[PDB]
């Protein structure tokens, strides 16, 4: 299968500079075109970058708002491509998709989430919320910075019957829930486990649903 | 620029109903430069058709694309549940590459009551000096929904935090998760903590509550 491993995401101040790389494989990266695309809540798509193929110029594109300030390249003796952003604003913020053209097919990377703030990172605080043929259970992930996190349940293997909300932003911090609906029989008899990924902080936190 | 223009930016569609989604670009675009994604909330964009009319692998048949110049559409002959998602057309006939706004596409269903769960501040936020109490309103049809709090009989409308997730691939329905937090002087002053819905379902209200004895 072909994969793209985005990275170099996270948190920077305004007028930094910051470098995304997206490590490539399961095809042949000399043929492909590689490009960036960026998105947002407010903006919502946008294409950022691109380049091209030794075989058709190597040429690298660039969207308006970021002429001058982004750099584009590739490393195909390691199946690599990178952005380089210098002097880097709020609009910048967003979750940046790193992917490859092959004749008219493409594909898209999980994406790298990149945060253009003053703001100080901080990581997440996990409380469980614990409480009739169906129960549910949740975990309050409050008081993070930045985006994103992720949520899990028994380590994914708990994935029918979830609800993880988007994150709410107040105070420069955010705050989510995420819910779980299991049968009465298995709860508390089998465990149930909320996992929550902060990689900005580079935290992970398990907590057990245990009665009341 | 190319701006390319995607109206409605939603649009809801009954089971088996043919839906279309226009595209309206600013200038001419080559046909051959004219694509759509799909994009599902916690997922990255899927190309779904390449070249306006040819289907990517994996689309299933009732899909289609048509259109030329400055007007393209896709098509959904029988609309079904796993239909419902975000659609972009996007354009790389004249540099810069451009995307549509995008269409939020939803599916209908028979009409479901909110399942209410109130949860009371946890231990550990209690040692910190805070206090949430956390309210799911899960699988309701349709999206309209209202919630309101209550502490002691009284209405409350400061420190609470709502959020909503998009429609479900497999059942149709929609959720929401309410959190009110109060200081922990603030919370320890009151007793009855009560989260009640508001959905085209009743008449009255569903209502959950707790008391802190």
């Known amino acids: 299968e072909v994969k793209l491993e985005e990275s170099g995401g996270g948190l920077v101040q305004p007028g930094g500079s910051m470098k995304l790389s997206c490590a490539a494989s399961g095809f042949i990266f000399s043929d492909a075109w590689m490009d960036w695309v960026r998105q947002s809540p407010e903006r919502g798509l946008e294409w950022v970058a691109e380049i091209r193929s030794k075989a058709n110029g190597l040429a690298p594109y660039y969207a308006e708002s970021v002429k001058g300030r982004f750099t584009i390249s590739r490393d195909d003796s390691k199946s690599s491509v990178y952005l380089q952003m210098n002097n880097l604003r709020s609009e910048d913020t967003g979750i940046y998709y790193c992917?490859?053209?092959?004749?008219?097919?493409?594909?898209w990377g999980q994406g790298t989430t990149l945060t253009v703030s003053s703001a100080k990172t901080t990581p997440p605080s996990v409380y469980p919320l614990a409480p009739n043929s169906m129960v549910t259970l949740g975990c309050l992930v409050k008081g993070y910075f930045p985006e994103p996190v992720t949520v899990t349940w028994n380590s994914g293997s708990l994935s029918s019957g979830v609800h993880t909300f988007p994150a709410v932003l107040q105070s420069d911090l955010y705050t989510l829930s995420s819910s779980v609906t299991v049968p009465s029989s298995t709860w508390p008899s089998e465990t149930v486990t909320c996992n929550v990924a902060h990689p900005a902080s580079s935290t992970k936190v398990d907590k057990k649903i245990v009665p009341r | 620029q190319i701006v390319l223009t995607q109206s409605p930016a939603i649009m809801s569609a009954f089971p088996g109903e043919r839906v279309t989604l226009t595209c309206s670009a600013s200038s001419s675009v080559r046909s051959s430069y004219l694509c759509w994604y799909q994009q599902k909330p916690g997922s990255s964009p899927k190309l779904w058709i390449y070249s306006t009319s040819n289907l990517a692998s994996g689309v299933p048949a009732r899909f289609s694309g048509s259109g030329s110049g400055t007007s393209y559409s896709l098509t959904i002959s029988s609309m079904e549940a796993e239909d419902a998602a975000s659609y972009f057309c996007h354009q790389w006939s004249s540099y810069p590459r451009t995307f549509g706004g995008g269409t939020k596409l939803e599916i209908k269903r028979a009409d479901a009551a909110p399942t209410v769960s109130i949860f009371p501040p946890s231990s550990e936020q209690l040692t910190s000096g805070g206090a949430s109490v956390v309210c799911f309103l899960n699988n309701f049809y349709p999206k309209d929904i209202n919630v309101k709090w209550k502490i002691d009989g009284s209405e409350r409308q400061n420190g609470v935090l709502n959020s909503w997730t998009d429609q479900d691939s497999k059942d149709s329905t929609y959720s929401m998760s309410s959190t009110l937090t109060l200081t922990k002087d603030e919370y320890e002053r009151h007793n009855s903590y009560t989260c009640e819905a508001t959905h085209k379902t009743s008449t009255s209200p569903i209502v959950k509550s707790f008391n802190r004895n």
């Open positions: 992917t490859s053209t092959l004749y008219y097919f493409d594909y």
